[PDB]
UniProtKB/Swiss-Prot annotation:
Pfam families: Lipocalin. Under physiological conditions beta-lactoglobulin exists as an equilibrium mixture of monomeric and dimeric forms. Interaction with LMBR1L which mediates the endocytosis of LGB has been observed in PubMed:17991420, but not in PubMed:23964685. GO terms for molecular function: identical protein binding; long-chain fatty acid binding; retinol binding. The lineage of its organism: Eukaryota, Metazoa, Chordata, Craniata, Vertebrata. Changing residue 59 to H: In variant C; found only in the Jersey breed. GO terms for cellular component: extracellular region. This is Beta-lactoglobulin. Keywords: Allergen, Disulfide bond, Milk protein, Retinol-binding, Secreted, Signal, Transport. It is found in: Secreted. Synthesized in mammary gland and secreted in milk. Alternate disulfide bonds occur in equal amounts in all variants examined.
Amino acid sequence: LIVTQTMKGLDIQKVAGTWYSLAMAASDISLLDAQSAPLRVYVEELKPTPEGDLEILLQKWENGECAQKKIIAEKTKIPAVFKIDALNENKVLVLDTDYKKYLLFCMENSAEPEQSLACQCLVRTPEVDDEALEKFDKALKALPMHIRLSFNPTQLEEQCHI
Ligand SMILES: CCCCCCCCCCCCCC(=O)O
């Protein structure tokens, strides 16, 4: 479990709603560097199902356009860890959230050689929250990141943060 912080006592029903991907980092550059890069994903809405799973709406750049998408992260025995099913098993971990303002998460291909890893700082409103980027920088000091992006209020409101 390379990522070593997780949210204790995560109540998943309280992260429902609207989110902005204020920041992103990844273990290598090709994962985030272009607008089409594999894990350049912008989060729009989180929707926990009754059964404790988590529906995810995001935006991704695709055939020259910003495309809305739907992904379900299935719950696990561990409340802060969820599993996404594509050709591979990708865990999603919630490090910290205060529900009302911010939420940090990482996601890892387990266990791709070396190992690939992307994290994000979600915030509830289009505002550079000084405080939630502290916590996001702190959480990643341990982790090996090599690209780090952040957006301003203008891009937060456009599709695909253009
Ligand atoms: C707890 C909420 C965290 C949001 C997790 C977003 C995970 C993004 C996975 C995207 C991988 C598939 C991209 C695609 O659909 O082509």
